[PDB]
């Protein structure tokens, strides 16, 4: 079993759960719940919904994962 991701909220989907939608351009979306599906039908944007992973990312909430890339200072020595 593969565990899929919500196209809208970024949440996780376990099997037998949520829905799957297929748009006229032959694209796929996966929804965990009728909530997300209904807002998608209402053609909202997730970047302005406050309980989404995209929102929290773009606003840098829970962003303690990535810190920095250090700087190297060392000669060839060869």
């Amino acid at each position: 079993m593969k565990v899929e991701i919500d196209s809208f909220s970024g949440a996780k989907i376990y099997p037998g759960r949520g829905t799957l939608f297929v748009r006229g351009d032959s694209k796929i979306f996966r929804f965990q719940n009728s909530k997300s599906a209904s807002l998608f039908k209402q053609r909202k944007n997730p970047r302005r919904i406050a309980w989404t992973v995209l929102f929290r990312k773009h606003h840098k909430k829970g962003i303690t994962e990535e810190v920095a890339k250090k700087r190297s200072r060392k000669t060839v020595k060869a």
């Binding site: 099997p15 037998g16 759960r17 949520g18 829905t19 799957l20 939608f21 297929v22 748009r23 006229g24 351009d25 032959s26 796929i28």
Partner: protein
Amino acid sequence: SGNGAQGTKFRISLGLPVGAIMNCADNSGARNLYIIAVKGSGSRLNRLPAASLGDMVMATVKKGKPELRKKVMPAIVVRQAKSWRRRDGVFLYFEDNAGVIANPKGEMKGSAITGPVGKECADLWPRVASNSGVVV
């Protein structure tokens, strides 16, 4: 389905009863198809014979070339727009009811198909599987 069947079909929820209209997917010179009958339907009082995906139906053309209008012809359903379940557990649905034209033994009148189809149809109607760009 029926004579052109490359096998069997697990059930899928009915969305397309008669009097229905579904867009045409192929390049046969049609726009919409008006369903009137379903091969394989049963018989219960005051129930409308309904179609689903993969099914073969009889249909007319309310818009398109007069070379095709005003006669009845076999058609296939490839998109349903109603949620149906797969045995892998997921429910799914397209956005539009869509079908194509065919002969009784499966061959298509057109050559190409626009937009996606259902695997439940591409696994049953092989000529559709060839002219399909997408299968899901």
